[PDB]
Amino acid sequence: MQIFVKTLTGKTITLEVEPSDTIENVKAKIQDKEGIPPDQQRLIFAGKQLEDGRTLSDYNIQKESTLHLVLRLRGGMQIFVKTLTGKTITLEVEPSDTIENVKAKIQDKEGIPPDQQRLIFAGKQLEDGRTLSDYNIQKESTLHLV
Amino acid sequence: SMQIFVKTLTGKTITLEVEPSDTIENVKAKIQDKEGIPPDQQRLIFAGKQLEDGRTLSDYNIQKESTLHLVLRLRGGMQIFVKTLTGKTITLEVEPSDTIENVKAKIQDKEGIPPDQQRLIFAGKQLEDGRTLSDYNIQKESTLHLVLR
Amino acid sequence: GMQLEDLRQQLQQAEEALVAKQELIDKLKEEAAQHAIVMETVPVLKAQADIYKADFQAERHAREKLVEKKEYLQEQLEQLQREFNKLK
Amino acid sequence: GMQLEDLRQQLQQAEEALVAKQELIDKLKEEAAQHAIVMETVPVLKAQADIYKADFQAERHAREKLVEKKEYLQEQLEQLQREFNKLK
C-alpha cells in the first residue's frame, strides 16, 4: 500500500508501506524522507495518537490513508554548547548524530562556520566522524566550543 | 451597560457585566475576580483576533451578548519554587499580591496536601495565611520551604 | 379571461421561485462541505495543545531539576568554605 | 376547457415543491449557524498552539539561563581548582 502523510501547514508526502509495519517503522521512514527524528514526530489517525507498539493493521489503516503529523517542540535528548563567551545554547539531538551534524546545528543557531569549531566534552577533543553516543554523551551533557 | 460571554476551549461559559468603554485588561480583572485566573495567564480573542489590554470593548466592535474566547497560558509571569524536606522542588505560578492561602492551595494542587497541614518558611521565618507574598518580600525565582504543620 | 392568466402567472412565478430556491440550496451545500474540511482538522489542533503542553512540562521539570542541583552545591559551597576560612 | 384544471394541478405540485425546498433551506440554515459557532473555535485553537509554543520558549530560555549560571560557576571553579593542586 501507499499511505499519505501531511502536516497542518502544507507538505503532503507519500510513503510506500505494508500493513504488518509498526508505528516506529513509519516514524523512521519519515526520518529518512523528511529528516525528522522519530521522537519528534507525533502521528494521528481517526482523531487518535498512534503508538510505536501497535501496527497499521491494529489501527485499521489501509491504502491512501492520510496520517496527520504534528511536530513536537523538542525531541527527547538535548545538550548544551558553552560558547567561548559562556553563552550557553541548547541543542536538540539523537545518540546517532555525528559531530558534524552537531556543528551544522551550531552553525544554524550561532553562525559559526563548522571548519572553525572545536568541541570538547570534559577533556577529549571530538571528531566529525563519530557520534555523540560514541563519546557516551548523555542528555543534559554540556560541550565546550573553541 | 451591556453584558458578554466568556468561553474557554474546554467548555464552561461565564457572564460578565461590562461597559462599552471598559478596557480588555479591565475584563481580565473581572475574569480574575470570579474565575480566579491571573490576567497574565489569559488571552482573549474576538473576531479571530487576540485582544490587546490597551484598547476597549467599543474599539473591537463588541455589543451586548458577544462571546469572547479565552485561552489559558501554561506559564504566566512570575514563578517561585517550593522545596520539600526531601529535596523535591516544585514551581508555583504567582503574583506579588498572592496570599499564603492562595499559595497553600496550589501546593495541594500538586502535592495533594491540605493547607491546614502545611508550614511554609522563608529564610527562618514562618509565613502567615493572612498576609501576602509581597509582605514577606518574596521575589521571582525565590525558593520556599515546606515542612508539615 | 383573467382566470386563465392568474394561474400561469402564478405557475410561472412559482417555477421561477424554484430556481432561486435551488441556487440557494446548492450554495449552502458546497459551503457546508467546505466548512466540513476545516472541521476535520480540529482533532489535530486539539492534540497539538496536548503535545505542546507536555513538551512545556518537560522543560519545567528539567528547569526544576537544575534549580535543585544549584540549591545543593551552593549549600555545600558554604561547607567547603567554613574550614577553608579557618585553616588558612 | 380542462385547461383551468391542468394548470391547477401543476400549481399545487409546484407550490408543494417550493415548500419542500424552503424547508430544506431552513434545515440547512440551522445547521450553518451551529457550524459557524464551532468554526469560531479554529482561529482560537490555532492561537492556543502559538501561545503554547511561546510559553514553552520562555521555559526553555529560563532553563538555559540556569545552565549558563551552573556552567559559569563551574567555570570559575576552574580558575580555582587549578591553583589548589598545582601549589601543594
From TrEMBL, chain A:
Sequence intervals crossing the membrane: none
Major location category of this protein: cytoplasm
Entry's localization field: Cytoplasm; Mitochondrion outer membrane; Nucleus
Keyword Mitochondrion among UniProt keywords: yes
A Gene Ontology term for the protein's cellular component: nucleus
Alphabetical keyword list: ADP-ribosylation, Cytoplasm, Isopeptide bond, Membrane, Mitochondrion, Mitochondrion outer membrane, Nucleus, Ubl conjugation
Residue ranges constituting the Ubiquitin-like domain according to the UniProt record: 1-76, 77-146
Family stated for the protein in its record: Belongs to the ubiquitin family.
Protein name, as recorded: UBC protein
Gene: UBC
Portion of the full-length sequence here: 1 to 146 of 305
